[PDB]
Ligand binder design. Structure first.
Ligand SMILES: *Cc1cc2c(cc1C)nc1c(=O)[nH]c(=O)nc-1n2C[C@H](O)[C@H](O)[C@H](O)COP(=O)(O)OP(=O)(O)OC[C@H]1O[C@@H](n2cnc3c(N)ncnc32)[C@H](O)[C@@H]1O
Ligand SMILES: *Cc1cc2c(cc1C)nc1c(=O)[nH]c(=O)nc-1n2C[C@H](O)[C@H](O)[C@H](O)COP(=O)(O)OP(=O)(O)OC[C@H]1O[C@@H](n2cnc3c(N)ncnc32)[C@H](O)[C@@H]1O
Lengths: 576, 576, 104, 52
């Protein structure tokens, strides 16, 4: 490790990697630090689902996710256990126990909020959905010129989608996908449009998808190397970044203070350009630990001198979930083109179709898969092939349905009784609401309590705002109930429900972007540069200042690409 | 990849790595294949608990374990779901669904049996307990000379313990450990002995233990390299080994047939020496897939020509578990040396001890930790420091208590109500029974059904034998109930219970060792060489032919070290 | 607030309550056995439309109570079984057991 | 509780739930035999399980 770099990046998630990709490629001398460790195999920061074993056992992947989601703020537990033996020790109170946060009101929490400390961040486990935001969900990059604003978002999103390998056709040969997609298209004809979820992923075979991650955006190998001999990058895992040091003018950052978790030593790192990409929670924590905003319980009697909107206007999406069991009408549709003679299991049994029959409802390839499955597996009562890929359907947020939708399968822990239902029949429904930004919704940091890395303990004061946010959240639930019924009835044990606040992990607005710090109540400008500061930039969902229902990562990467254009234009790389 | 090696090893768990360590070091040209992938970070095959984040969040580690344990044999599910919507599709039978094994009797299963396909195997997640077996649990290496047999096991175990970095003092500064250890010593004075569980682990700091793994035994880096310039090793992950090819004489193995999971291609690999270390289940599957033993449902009318004891006499341990909440008497004991004035939280509050007071029950260092905790954290009602390491206590198997015991903590998923109890109070109890080997207890492989890698589907026919095994199992449960009560009462939600058969993952005897193939009903000799075959060796717990209650890995490694002595003495390395 | 919506079931000859000739119940009478499924067609479509209607209507009053989310109850819990000895005008034409005076 | 105390199930199918955490000393049958007042005539998939 050197003491001096051109650019330093805190965090190795996909947004840090966007900075790294752009800036290492532009010839800057780049250091990236991550508090977490390399643990994705040889492809550093890659998606953990890209092993043969998870692609054959996809439900086991829920365990990978849960093993790397650490709860941000857990209130003090007041559950009564009154069946201990009389000999067991007990306190007379519900004292601060088991890593609970005593600052936290259990009634104004994001209990489901969690963070991932590993190289590649949350992109080592994410679902890879990368929709664009429409105007209504999206912050302005150009004022008073909607067409110009669209054009700019298009340019940036297009690059972001290249970096992530975003596509919309990886699931097109799935029977189940097409069965759901087509039924919903038909039922909402003239009302709504349905398409494949845009997914950051590349299909490698009929049974293997290479999901994208940080590693797709930038491979995270130290440079110079044989493939990039004139580039300069170092990744330092297991380094806790603790503070950026402001000059007295509050015009420039002068160093980054780090803690090496292996040696235990603390150091200062010097760079021309400082980029914080530690996530929406941890960017805020680092800034507040460096004297931005206000440490401690909000006190309006005592407004902070720097970045007074930091940690305010936070947004998290409401999330509703259920699973369905496919309808009889739809399963029978699968085999509509088939003539069936005899009885399954006997010698005379015959399942046939007429390729090219004008009265065929399905393409020949679909009918071939189905005939073959029914003739090869005559003990199986369903017409869907065993290895048929999952459904991946969306109707994207619109004004008349202001929520994002995912009609799909991801890894799930089915209970014993649920395991009784054939997996081919099951479809997951996740609808995501948009949350109005409100000054009163805050992420703050204790002045007394510390977390596991000895940093100020994060505390939420959040409730879903009254008015539109709450009305839409309930209308969203009703919409999932109505839409899901077109495909099948609910799966017992996975009935319609709101998920605990923050489980969707789409937190935004913690360090929000705008044109003008006071008028737009914000922390960074449209180049993601911290107001007042020449050389400090923030990346990630914390930048997003709007009420959004779609998955935010693509939008955050897009802002990061814009931010790097500013850097390339304003800082010269050192000579090599 | 080359076509020809001196030694080929199937599996990269700790036993394969023992072979690799011994044989690469002896100068053989070595290839190791593993069906699973590299996924432990830069230290290939290392323990996944050795990250800073798991050492600060140890309970999250259960999720890592569960994410890589894939059930061997799941019977067809007959659970009735009768609350589906009338529109949902349903079959009229409980048909073979969701990867269930139709050969499996749900009443004669090891439902808890599971396998791990990743580089380093199960040693990437294991608990690192490495006790030696006493004579009663241990197979003979020397006949009719008990002292000579002891001497040989001592030599081998001593080397194995070096390879694993086995120690018995890593937890000696734990208050909780000593509190439990001392109480139980006192209560069984003159009846039983208690000590630290022998643990394959090295303490790096007061809050970090480097748990050992395959990587400790052999680092798995390709050779030649800068540190080992005259050694030759290649590891090939994501390669399914499918068959060893017997000559017509059934005297030698001629090739190893592999499937490359990334390219999809199949190849044959040639070696002088073939070593199968794929685990107790998968070594058996590979052998049966190569024409050893009998494929299909056992049929005594038709005994196999080769290795007729393969897959018979299988053993798994009974396991009983509970958790306790430490007694008031014991917690108060912690602070017995303390004088306490005033009331906690006030200015006059004082907790003091007299270093060296002859009437002190504890050493000064213990009392310093306690005083400091009580004075620094006056809101906390317990005298145990927050970062106090866990208990790691055993009384080892003896004739008068023929079970292994672990009185300890490992990663656990505490439910909400259990989270209400301070973790410092909780102790896990796991007692492990020994199972009599019986010909009728079998692991067999279907001739029709295949698993996820298109290999013959494993099926168990197991019950805990009547007689001693079952009497001892129940006496073990009673013994845990009696012993645990000395420390505290049970924790609600973790009451005394038998764990599902096979969850302990200590399966043995599937390819058992003995002196004489017919007389000892066995598959390999005491050099782990397959009877009849000049150049085929099996490693692992499948070799162990006795009824054992202790954790088997150290014993398996020891046999592997003996096996490599035979190899070094009988096969010449190629020139480099 | 509790919400209970109750669907109507088409009478179908194939849906039967019968009595074992070998097995007996606790009073030593022939053991009752059902052979029932909710009929395809209208009954099942309406049942699902009913669920959707409860979801839509209930949302006007408040959100669901966790632990009491929308669900079908196990068949027969409503205890509104009918038609086991059904009434009609004409025994053969109306496939029935009693006339409109409830006389067999 | 009053309601549940006077509703007696009309037809309960034979139970096939696997319990595999009994002590090895406990008696067990090798089959899911007609137990506990279950009706062996009853198809568990064509029942009114809630009828009482
Ligand atoms: C977990 C999750 C995520 C998720 C997903 C499903 C799951 C279960 N599904 C989504 C999807 O389909 N589409 C999408 O748009 N979002 C979805 N996500 C969320 C997504 O993964 C995140 O939005 C994304 O990864 C955010 O990226 P970013 O680069 O901003 O942040 P990160 O991935 O959390 O990485 C941050 C890193 O910084 C480190 N760190 C934290 N603090 C420090 C300090 N102090 N010092 C040094 N490093 C720090 C981390 O360890 C981490 O790697
Ligand atoms: C999972 C578990 C293990 C465990 C433990 C706790 C948990 C939760 N606690 C124990 C402990 O405290 N002490 C101990 O002695 N045992 C404990 N264990 C068990 C232990 O990890 C195993 O006994 C040990 O790892 C066995 O070692 P071995 O090298 O024999 O086998 P393995 O680790 O399963 O590795 C086998 C590998 O081979 C591969 N494989 C399988 N089939 C194929 C084919 N066909 N081709 C190529 N490779 C194959 C695997 O993928 C694997 O890595």
């Amino acid at each position: 490790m050197d003491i001096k770099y051109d650019v330093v990046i805190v965090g190795s998630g996909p947004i840090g990697c966007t900075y790294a990709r752009e800036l290492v490629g532009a010839g800057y001398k780049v250091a990236m630090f991550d508090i977490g460790e390399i643990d994705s195999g040889l492809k550093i920061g890659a998606h953990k689902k890209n092993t043969v074993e998870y692609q054959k056992n996809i439900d086991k992947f829920v365990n990978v996710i849960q093993g790397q989601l650490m709860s941000v703020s857990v209130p003090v537990n007041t559950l009564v256990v009154d069946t201990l033996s009389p000999t067991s020790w007990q306190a007379s109170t519900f004292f601060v126990r088991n890593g609970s946060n005593p600052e936290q009101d259990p009634l104004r929490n994001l209990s489901g909020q969690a963070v991932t400390r590993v190289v590649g961040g949350m992109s080592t486990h994410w679902g890879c959905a990368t929709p664009r935001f429409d105007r209504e969900q999206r912050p302005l990059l150009v004022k008073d010129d909607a067409d110009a604003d669209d054009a700019e978002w298009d340019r940036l999103y297009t690059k972001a989608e290249s970096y992530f390998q975003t596509g919309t056709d990886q699931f097109k040969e799935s029977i189940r996908h097409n069965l759901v997609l087509n039924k919903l298209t038909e039922e909402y004809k003239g009302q709504r449009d349905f398409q494949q979820i845009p997914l950051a992923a590349t299909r490698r075979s009929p049974t293997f998808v290479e999901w994208s991650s940080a590693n797709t955006v930038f491979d995270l190998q130290n440079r110079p190397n044989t493939d990039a001999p004139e580039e300069r990058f170092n990744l330092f895992p297991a380094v806790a970044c603790e503070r950026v040091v402001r000059n007295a003018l509050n015009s420039e950052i002068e160093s980054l203070h780090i803690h090496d978790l292996i040696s235990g030593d603390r150091f200062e790192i010097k760079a021309d350009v400082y980029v914080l990409t530690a996530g929406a929670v941890h960017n805020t924590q680092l800034l507040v630990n460096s004297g931005f905003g206000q440490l401690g319980r909000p006190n309006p009697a005592n407004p902070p001198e720097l970045l007074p909107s930091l940690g305010s206007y936070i947004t998290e999406q409401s999330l509703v979930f259920c699973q369905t069991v496919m309808s009889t009408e739809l399963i029978d549709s699968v085999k509509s083109d088939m003539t069936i003679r005899g009885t399954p299991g006997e010698l005379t049994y015959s399942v046939t179709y007429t390729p090219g029959a004008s009265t065929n409802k399905h393409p020949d390839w679909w009918n071939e898969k189905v005939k073959n499955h029914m003739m090869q597996h005559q003990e199986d009562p369903l017409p869907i092939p065993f290895e048929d890929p999952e459904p991946q359907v969306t109707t994207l947020f619109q004004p008349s349905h202001p929520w994002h939708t995912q009609i799909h399968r991801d890894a799930f822990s089915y209970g014993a009784v649920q395991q009784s239902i054939d997996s081919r029949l099951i479809v997951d429904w996740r609808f995501f609401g948009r949350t109005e930004p409100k000054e009163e919704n805050k992420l703050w940091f204790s002045d007394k309590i510390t977390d596991a890395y000895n940093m100020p303990q994060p505390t939420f004061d959040f409730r879903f705002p009254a008015g539109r946010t709450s009305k839409e959240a309930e209308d969203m639930m009703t919409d999932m109930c109505v839409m899901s019924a077109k495909i099948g009835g609910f799966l017992p044990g996975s009935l319609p429900q709101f998920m605990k606040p923050g489980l969707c992990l789409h937190l935004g607005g913690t360090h929000r972007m705008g044109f003008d710090e006071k008028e737009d109540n914000c922390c960074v400008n449209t180049d993601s540069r911290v107001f007042g500061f020449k050389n400090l930039f923030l990346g990630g969902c914390g930048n997003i200042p709007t009420a959004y229902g779609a998955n935010p990562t693509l939008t955050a990467m897009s802002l990061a690409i814009k931010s790097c254009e500013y850097i390339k234009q304003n800082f010269t790389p050192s000579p090599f």
